Amino acid sequence: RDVVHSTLRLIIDCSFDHLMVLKDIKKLHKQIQRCYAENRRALHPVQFYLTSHGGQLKKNMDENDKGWVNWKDIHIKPEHYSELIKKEDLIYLTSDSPNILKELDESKAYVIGGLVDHNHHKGLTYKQASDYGINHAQLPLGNFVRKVLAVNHVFEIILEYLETRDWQEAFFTILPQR
Numbered sequence: 327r328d329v330v331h332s333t334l335r336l337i338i339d340c341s342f343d344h345l346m347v348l349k350d351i352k353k354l355h356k357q358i359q360r361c362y363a364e365n366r367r368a369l370h371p372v373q374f375y376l377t378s379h380g381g382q383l384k385k386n387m388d389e390n391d392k393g394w395v396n397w398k399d400i401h402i403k404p405e406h407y408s409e410l411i412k413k414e415d416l417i418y419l420t421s422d423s424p425n426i427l428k429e430l431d432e433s434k435a436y437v438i439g440g441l442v443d444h445n446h447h448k449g450l451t452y453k454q455a456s457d458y459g460i461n462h463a464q465l466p467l468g469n470f471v472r473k474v475l476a477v478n479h480v481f482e483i484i485l486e487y488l489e490t491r492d493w494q495e496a497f498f499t500i501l502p503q504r
């Protein structure tokens with residue numbers, strides 16, 4: 327299939343490894359596998375990044391997904407996203423940001439926190455983004471939906487919005503119902 331990739335850079339910031347138990351690391355690994363499989367099947371796949379790759383996640387990936395070094399159309403880097411992407415290009419996605427995302431800028435790099443929180447580290451990614459001086463925004467969930475979404479849910483919404491250009495349709499397709 328002749329696939330037209332989106333210029334949008336989508337980074338899973340894996341610098342929170344030490345804040346998760348091995349059980350939550352395995353859950354993050356499972357969510358990353360879902361992001362990879364959905365990106366490879368997307369109409370307009372993003373430039374997928376896995377930054378700060380190390381610790382428990384790297385060892386769990388070395389043990390179960392031995393072929394992660396062979397993985398195609400993914401940037402798996404041990405460096406922090408700050409070391410690889412320009413400060414002005416970054417937008418950290420976080421539910422605690424007061425900024426409401428209206429449109430996606432395909433020239434920017436959007437960051438998703440590689441964290442299975444369980445509502446324990448409330449406002450952590452928003453605090454780290456504000457301290458570093460980088461831009462931050464929340465998904466326009468409004469009245470459709472804790473508004474905290476899983477790593478793969480945020481990633482899949484970005485892919486669905488690049489296809490539909492309708493936020494309401496993107497949340498409806500990806501988010502699980504009660």
Ligand SMILES: Nc1ncnc2c1ncn2[C@@H]1O[C@H](CSCC[C@H](N)C(=O)O)[C@@H](O)[C@H]1O
Pocket residue numbers: 418419420421437438439440441442443445446447448449450451452463464465467473474475476477480
């Ligand atoms: N409503 C929302 N809008 C934007 N990004 C969101 C979101 N809900 C979750 N995310 C993203 O999904 C990631 C995993 S959820 C972890 C939440 C954690 N308490 C935090 O401080 O972010 C988050 O780090 C964030 O990047």
